[PDB]
Amino acid sequence: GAEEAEEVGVEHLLRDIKDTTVGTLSQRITNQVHGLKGLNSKLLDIRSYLEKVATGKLPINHQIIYQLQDVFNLLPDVSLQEFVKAFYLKTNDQMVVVYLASLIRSVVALHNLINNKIANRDAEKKEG
Amino acid sequence: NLPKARAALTSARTTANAIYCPPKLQATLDMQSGIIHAAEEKDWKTAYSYFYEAFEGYDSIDSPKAITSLKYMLLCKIMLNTPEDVQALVSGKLALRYAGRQTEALKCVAQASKNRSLADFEKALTDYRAELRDDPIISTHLAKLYDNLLEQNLIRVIEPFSRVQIEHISSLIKLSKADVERKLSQMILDKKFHGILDQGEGVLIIFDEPPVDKTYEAALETIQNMSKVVDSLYNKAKKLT
Amino acid sequence: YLMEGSYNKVFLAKGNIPAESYTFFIDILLDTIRDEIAGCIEKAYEKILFTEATRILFFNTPKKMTDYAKKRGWVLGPNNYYSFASQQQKPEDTTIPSTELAKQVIEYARQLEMIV
Amino acid sequence: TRPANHRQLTFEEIAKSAKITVNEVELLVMKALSVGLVKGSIDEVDKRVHMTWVQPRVLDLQQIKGMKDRLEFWCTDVKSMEMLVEHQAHDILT
């Protein structure tokens, strides 16, 4: 945890780093760290659930392995796990994101396009 | 006759403003001020105040002329939103003061059409054939009560549960196709009732979701944006030529 | 009149269609009748019966329409005809339209990046 | 035992193998509602005993070994498709 101000030293001693306005690659940094750094921890969990099958004594199945094989049994299923509720539920999801991107990025088309043209041709033919 | 009583209004506000001691016909003009001005809907109750000073100007008046000089104001208390005529006036001493009879039918119809189980208007429509009287002269004083009580009954039967086929919900009116379909479709038109009826299966279904300001607000704002871009196209055509 | 909708204007035309050996080509015209029947015998149809194979097809019954009952994967019903038991072979195609659209979100969201 | 879908199960294996009748399957879950290990949303227009989250088992050491087709499946498939996203989102490294 970080308590108080203390960055008269610290954030002067940054001398490298930028506050990213997330949506500017910081998300893919988190993608590498949770995907990679989560799934190598999953490889530690196949070290668990392979080495304990191999050489693991009494905490092989003490009291939390099957108990959190429940939590593993949230959604581990076989072929494609068949989330049939989640696909028109996903129409209710991607509903929102594509409607906002559609209408709102047409507003962004006004944002970029319109005054891009105005200041464009002011800078262009008002140069003469 | 609102045009003819409008001519009586204009001759009343200045012709009868000049007669010095007309106390009897003054309360008659007050009955005109209750009748015509609730008929213009000046106010729901100040017109009744004109009936109500009109009322106390109806002493030393002839007793058949007296008892017809009260029907419009007891009938105004019938036309007093909440049918509260029973509890105050006709179980009160006034109808038990004079030789009124029709008002004593106004007791039972003002009470059984307080019970909200109908049983009353259809039954005593014959009992009110004398009280309907001039078919085209009142036309309102029972039609607003009962033609309110239509959709009052509709919000007793259709309000508690939305979807229903058309005949069993209309089993409490026992016509299935005459006017209850037109009344309910009128309530679709009047937005008290957001549903869709049916005839092929005859299955009424109620559901609604109007508001999407995501579509409405953004879309109409962008139409306004199109107007302001059109407002910019003359800065464009101006900087061209 | 072919593309108007008359396969019998064929047989009205073939009354005088020799036309200096325009016989091979009207035989291949009979071919482009019959294989289009092999398309259009049950295209969006319920079913037909034998007399429709007497009308649209001709030559009553060869082993060519018996071949048509035994070439295309055909249900020769008892004086009855079916393309299949369903004629359309159960169209759902994905039963999941969403995840490939998330691949559209992959490259499309990438396209939203690199530009401004 | 079947991990996959058709979790809105009909009562047929319930009325067959669990030696119960059709009128009691509701009690068989409502008492299970008082139990609280499984909390299914049982259909009653089709009498379908729906499967939600459960307390699954106690030990399947053959599936403590044989969990690889879910665990390593998860590992290299969320990691591999992770690298399919990051391989698509590659030259926006910027």
From Swiss-Prot, chain A:
Q: Which cysteines are joined by disulfide bonds?
A: none
Positions the record marks as coiled coil are: none
- Transmembrane region positions? none
Modified residue N6-acetyllysine is at which positions? 42, 52
Q: Where's the Glycyl lysine isopeptide (Lys-Gly) (interchain with G-Cter in ubiquitin) crosslink?
A: 18
Any miscellaneous information on file? Does not bind a metal ion.
Q: How does it assemble?
A: Component of the 19S proteasome regulatory particle complex. The 26S proteasome consists of a 20S core particle (CP) and two 19S regulatory subunits (RP). The regulatory particle is made of a lid composed of 9 subunits including PSMD7, a base containing 6 ATPases and few additional components. Within the complex, PSMD7 interacts with subunit PSMD4 through their respective MPN domain. Interacts with TRIM5.
Q: Which family does it belong to?
A: Belongs to the peptidase M67A family.
Its biological purpose is as follows: Component of the 26S proteasome, a multiprotein complex involved in the ATP-dependent degradation of ubiquitinated proteins. This complex plays a key role in the maintenance of protein homeostasis by removing misfolded or damaged proteins, which could impair cellular functions, and by removing proteins whose functions are no longer required. Therefore, the proteasome participates in numerous cellular processes, including cell cycle progression, apoptosis, or DNA damage repair.
Identify this protein by name. Answer: 26S proteasome non-ATPase regulatory subunit 7
Recorded source organism is: Homo sapiens (Human)
Give the organism's phylogenetic lineage.
Answer: Eukaryota, Metazoa, Chordata, Craniata, Vertebrata
| Gene name of the encoded protein | PSMD7
Segment of the intact protein contained: 163 to 290 of 324
UniProtKB/Swiss-Prot annotation, chain B:
Task: Give the UniProt keywords, A-Z.
Answer: Acetylation, Cytoplasm, Isopeptide bond, Nucleus, Phosphoprotein, Proteasome, Ubl conjugation
For this protein, what is any one GO molecular function term?
Answer: structural molecule activity
The UniProt record lists the Glycyl lysine isopeptide (Lys-Gly) (interchain with G-Cter in SUMO2) crosslink at 93
| Localization, UniProt | Nucleus; Cytoplasm, Cytosol
Domain PCI, by residue range, is 43-211
A Gene Ontology biological process annotation?
Answer: proteasome assembly
Induction data = By FOXO4; expression in embryonic stem cells (ESCs) is mediated by FOXO4.
GO terms for CC?
cytosol; extracellular region; ficolin-1-rich granule lumen; membrane; nucleoplasm; nucleus; proteasome accessory complex; proteasome complex
| Highest taxon in the source lineage | Eukaryota
How is expression of this protein distributed across tissues? Highly expressed in embryonic stem cells (ESCs). Expression decreases as ESCs differentiate.
Assign the protein's first listed, main location to one coarse class: nucleus
| Posttranslational mods | Phosphorylated by AMPK.
Q: What family is this?
A: Belongs to the proteasome subunit S9 family.
What job does the chain carry out?
Component of the 26S proteasome, a multiprotein complex involved in the ATP-dependent degradation of ubiquitinated proteins. This complex plays a key role in the maintenance of protein homeostasis by removing misfolded or damaged proteins, which could impair cellular functions, and by removing proteins whose functions are no longer required. Therefore, the proteasome participates in numerous cellular processes, including cell cycle progression, apoptosis, or DNA damage repair. In the complex, PSMD11 is required for proteasome assembly.
Q: What is this protein called?
A: 26S proteasome non-ATPase regulatory subunit 11
- Please give the organism: Homo sapiens
Full-protein interval shown: 182 to 422 of 422
Swiss-Prot record, chain C:
Give the record's subunit note: Component of the 19S proteasome regulatory particle complex. The 26S proteasome consists of a 20S core particle (CP) and two 19S regulatory subunits (RP). The regulatory particle is made of a lid composed of 9 subunits including PSMD8, a base containing 6 ATPases and few additional components. Interacts with DDI2. Interacts with TASOR.
- Family to which this protein belongs: Belongs to the proteasome subunit S14 family.
This protein's record includes keyword Phosphoprotein: yes
* Protein name, entry field: 26S proteasome non-ATPase regulatory subunit 8
Q: Output the Gene Ontology cellular-component terms.
A: cytosol; nucleoplasm; nucleus; proteasome accessory complex; proteasome complex; proteasome regulatory particle; proteasome regulatory particle, lid subcomplex
Q: Which GO terms describe its biological process?
A: proteasome-mediated ubiquitin-dependent protein catabolic process
| Membrane spanning stretches | none
Keywords of the record, alphabetical order, are:
Isopeptide bond, Phosphoprotein, Proteasome, Ubl conjugation
Annotated crosslink Glycyl lysine isopeptide (Lys-Gly) (interchain with G-Cter in SUMO2) location: 63
Q: What does this protein do?
A: Component of the 26S proteasome, a multiprotein complex involved in the ATP-dependent degradation of ubiquitinated proteins. This complex plays a key role in the maintenance of protein homeostasis by removing misfolded or damaged proteins, which could impair cellular functions, and by removing proteins whose functions are no longer required. Therefore, the proteasome participates in numerous cellular processes, including cell cycle progression, apoptosis, or DNA damage repair.
Curated annotation (Swiss-Prot), chain D:
Q: Where are the transmembrane segments?
A: none
Free-text function comment from the UniProt entry: Component of the 26S proteasome, a multiprotein complex involved in the ATP-dependent degradation of ubiquitinated proteins. This complex plays a key role in the maintenance of protein homeostasis by removing misfolded or damaged proteins, which could impair cellular functions, and by removing proteins whose functions are no longer required. Therefore, the proteasome participates in numerous cellular processes, including cell cycle progression, apoptosis, or DNA damage repair.
Which family is annotated?
A: Belongs to the proteasome subunit S11 family.
Which cysteines does the record link by disulfide bonds? none
PTM annotation (N6-acetyllysine): residues: 16
Protein name per UniProt: 26S proteasome non-ATPase regulatory subunit 13
What is its quaternary makeup?
Component of the 19S proteasome regulatory particle complex. The 26S proteasome consists of a 20S core particle (CP) and two 19S regulatory subunits (RP). The regulatory particle is made of a lid composed of 9 subunits including PSMD13, a base containing 6 ATPases and few additional components.
Specify the superkingdom: Eukaryota
